[PDB]
GROMACS .gro file of C-alpha atoms in nm:
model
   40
    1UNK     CA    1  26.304  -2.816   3.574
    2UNK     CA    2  26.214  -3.185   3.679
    3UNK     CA    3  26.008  -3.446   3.527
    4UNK     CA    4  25.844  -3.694   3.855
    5UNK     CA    5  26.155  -3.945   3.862
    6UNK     CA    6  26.391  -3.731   4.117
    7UNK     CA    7  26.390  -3.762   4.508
    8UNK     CA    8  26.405  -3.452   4.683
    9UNK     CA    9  26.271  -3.305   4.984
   10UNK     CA   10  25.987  -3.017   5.003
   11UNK     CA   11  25.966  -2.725   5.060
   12UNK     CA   12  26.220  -2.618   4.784
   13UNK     CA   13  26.340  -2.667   4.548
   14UNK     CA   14  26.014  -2.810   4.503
   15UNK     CA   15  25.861  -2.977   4.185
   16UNK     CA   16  25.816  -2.682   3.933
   17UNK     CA   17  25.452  -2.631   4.078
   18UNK     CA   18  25.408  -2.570   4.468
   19UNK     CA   19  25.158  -2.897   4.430
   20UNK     CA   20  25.451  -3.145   4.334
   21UNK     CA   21  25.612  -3.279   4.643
   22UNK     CA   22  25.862  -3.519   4.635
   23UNK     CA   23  25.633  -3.837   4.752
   24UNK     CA   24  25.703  -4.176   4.714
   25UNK     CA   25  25.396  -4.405   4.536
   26UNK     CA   26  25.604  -4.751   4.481
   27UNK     CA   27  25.642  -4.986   4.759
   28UNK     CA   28  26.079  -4.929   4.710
   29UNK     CA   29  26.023  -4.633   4.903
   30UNK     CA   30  26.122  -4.446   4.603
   31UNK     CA   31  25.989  -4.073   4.708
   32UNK     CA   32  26.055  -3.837   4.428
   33UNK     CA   33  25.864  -3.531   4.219
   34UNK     CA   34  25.530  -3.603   4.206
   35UNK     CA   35  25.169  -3.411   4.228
   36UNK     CA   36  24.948  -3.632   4.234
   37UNK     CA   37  24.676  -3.395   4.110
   38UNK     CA   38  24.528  -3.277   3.758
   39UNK     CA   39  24.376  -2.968   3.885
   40UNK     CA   40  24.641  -2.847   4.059
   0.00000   0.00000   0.00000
């Protein structure tokens, strides 16, 4: 589906899991697929 390098918007298509939101964790701003989470 997608890696954590693509900027999107939640809810869908989402991340592959319903924990990966597309959230940005750089200071560019750059909000993309991303959990943040092990267990999850």
């Amino acid at each position: 589906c997608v890696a954590t390098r693509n900027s999107c918007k939640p809810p869908a298509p989402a991340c592959c899991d319903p924990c990966a939101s597309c959230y940005c964790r750089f200071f560019r701003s750059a909000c993309y697929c991303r959990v943040l989470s092990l267990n999850c």
